[PDB]
């Protein structure tokens, strides 16, 4: 089964002043998420769900990485393909979890910033883990985004944010596709990571100015490919290639996101073991087909809010994530 975890965001200053009380309770020991759906103080009703891991509002970035990503990166380094999806309503922490932010007032360098998310921590760790273990390696990254079923390359420095990419089936891969023009940037060392990320961020700002609700309606796929070569004591070369897809999905809240709709239908088809799985019905599911009931080790981080105002969407997200737990994958 694929791994499904839940992360609740902490209250913001506005909610803090309103003396808001959380309707979400996370028990890491029991690995459960309990939501107050009604009831008055001394008695109420609740909805509880169990997941592989649960992270409360106070969970720090480093702990999400240690608990969820560390094991996944080790697998990527073993030469397997892995994917991590961030799913949930806009404003619940998908981007904070997948990307992170900078601590205010330049208190920390990017490498030591406690607010850094999965992407920067992962890139930094790859270089650390392969510092001198005898494995020669190269790291390449790409950032593909889907908006209104159109494809954009956020790491191409010479292309206009208006330029769309074309997708084709891979002749030498039945369930694979080729994204013509998608640029792969080589990360030569840890000291090249931040600037590369900043460039993509700058280009996304241009995208936001041009496309409506870009940050919430778009799907982003940040891919890291590690080509590795080991040489045995007898001179033989051992090759392994690991790939990690870090996906920040469009907000799940209740116009017409074909890829988001298709992702849900694919999950339903997989869990209900229906013969036909509609992978080809959206660009997102075609690109990530192997991550959904395929040979890629997949994990989903469902993000929720502690505010009573978001009760309906929170329950929807939990029900969606809990169902996804039934998806079966077959690693390499």
Ligand X SMILES: CCOC(=O)C1=C(C)NC(=S)N[C@H]1c1cccc(O)c1
The footprint of ligand ADP (CB under 6 A) covers: 9-10, 88, 90-96, 101, 303
Smallest separation, CB 224 to ligand X (Å)? 11
Distance CA 308, CA 36 (A): 8
Distance CA 165, CA 245 (A): 19
Q: Of 224 and 300, which has the nearer Cβ to ligand X?
A: 224
Distance CA 27, CA 43 (A): 20
CA distances from 254 to 38, 47, 235, 261 (A): 21, 21, 58, 11
Q: Does 198 bind ligand X (CB under 6 A)?
A: yes
Q: Does 101 bind ligand X (CB under 6 A)?
A: yes
Q: Of 104 and 235, which has the nearer Cβ to ligand ADP?
A: 104
Q: Are 147 and 164 in contact (CB under 8 A)?
A: no
Q: Which does 201 bind (CB under 5 to 8 A by kind): Mg ion, ligand ADP, ligand X, none?
A: ligand X
Q: Of 88 and 117, which has the nearer Cβ to ligand X?
A: 117
Q: Which long-range contacts (CB under 8 A, 24 or more apart) does 175-180 make?
A: 175/279, 175/289, 175/290, 175/294, 176/290, 177/286, 177/287, 179/144, 179/151, 179/287
Which of 59, 61, 92, 95 is the binder for Mg ion (CB under 5 A)? 95
Q: Does 97 bind Mg ion (CB under 5 A)?
A: no
Helix H or strand E encompassing 60? none
Identify which of 115, 116, 117, 134 has the alpha carbon closest to the alpha carbon of residue 77.
134
Q: Does 115 bind ligand X (CB under 6 A)?
A: yes
Q: Which does 204 bind (CB under 5 to 8 A by kind): Mg ion, ligand X, ligand ADP, none?
A: none
Question: Exposed, middle or buried, 303 (CB in 10 Å: 0-12/13-18/19+)?
Answer: buried
Q: Which residues are part of a known binding site for ATP? A: 88-95
Smallest separation, CB 57 to ligand ADP (Å)? 7
Q: Name the phi and psi angles at 115, rounded to 5.
A: -90, -5
CB count within 10 Å of CB 227 equals 15
Q: Of 9 and 243, which has the nearer Cβ to Mg ion?
A: 9
Smallest separation, CB 31 to ligand ADP (Å)? 18
Q: Which does 145 bind (CB under 5 to 8 A by kind): ligand ADP, Mg ion, ligand X, none?
A: none
Q: Which does 100 bind (CB under 5 to 8 A by kind): ligand X, ligand ADP, Mg ion, none?
A: ligand X
Distance CA 192, CA 209 (A): 27
- How many residues line the site for Mg ion (CB under 5 A)? 2
Q: Are 266 and 279 in contact (CB under 8 A)?
A: yes
Q: Which does 242 bind (CB under 5 to 8 A by kind): ligand X, Mg ion, ligand ADP, none?
A: none
Q: Does 99 bind ligand X (CB under 6 A)?
A: yes
Smallest separation, CB 111 to ligand ADP (Å)? 19
Smallest separation, CB 54 to ligand X (Å)? 24
The partner residues of 185 in beta bridges, in order of sequence, read 141
Q: Of 108 and 127, which has the nearer Cβ to ligand ADP?
A: 108
CB count within 10 Å of CB 4 equals 25
Smallest separation, CB 150 to ligand ADP (Å)? 20
Interface residue list for Mg ion (CB under 5 A):
94-95
Interface residue list for ligand X (CB under 6 A):
99-102, 110, 113, 115-117, 119-120, 194, 197-198, 201
């Amino acid at each position: 089964n694929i791994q499904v975890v839940v992360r609740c965001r902490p209250f913001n200053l506005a909610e803090r002043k309103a003396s808001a009380h959380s309707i979400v309770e996370c028990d890491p020991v029991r690995k459960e998420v309990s939501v107050r759906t009604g009831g008055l103080a001394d008695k109420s009703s609740r909805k509880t769900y169990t997941f592989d891991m649960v992270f409360g509002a106070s969970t720090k970035q480093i702990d999400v990485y240690r608990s969820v990503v560390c094991p996944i990166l080790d697998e990527v380094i073993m030469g397997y393909n892995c994917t991590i999806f961030a799913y949930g309503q806009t404003g619940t922490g998908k981007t904070f979890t997948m990307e992170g932010e900078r601590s205010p007032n330049e208190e920390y360098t990017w490498e030591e910033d406690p607010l850094a998310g999965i992407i920067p921590r992962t890139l930094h760790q790859i270089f650390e883990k392969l510092t001198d273990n005898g494995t020669e390696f190269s790291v390449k990254v790409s950032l593909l985004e889907i908006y209104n079923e159109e494809l954009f390359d956020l790491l191409n420095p010479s292309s206009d944010v208006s330029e769309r990419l074309q997708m084709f089936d891979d002749p030498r891969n039945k369930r694979g596709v080729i994204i013509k023009g998608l640029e792969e940037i080589t990360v030569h060392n840890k000291d090249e990571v931040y600037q590369i990320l900043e460039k993509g961020a700058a280009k996304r700002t241009t995208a936001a100015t041009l496309m409506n609700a870009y940050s919430s309606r778009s799907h982003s796929v940040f891919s890291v490919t590690i080509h590795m070569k080991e040489t045995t004591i007898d001179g033989e070369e051992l090759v392994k290639i690991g790939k990690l897809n870090l996906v920040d999905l469009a907000g799940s809240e209740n116009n017409i996101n074909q890829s988001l709709l298709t992702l849900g239908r694919v999950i339903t088809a997989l869990v209900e073991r229906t013969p036909h799985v509609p992978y080809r019905e959206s660009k997102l599911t075609r690109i990530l087909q192997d991550s959904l009931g395929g040979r890629t080790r997949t994990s989903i981080i469902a993000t929720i809010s502690p505010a009573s105002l978001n009760l309906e969407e929170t329950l929807s997200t939990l029900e969606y994530a809990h169902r996804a737990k039934n998806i079966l994958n077959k690693p390499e």
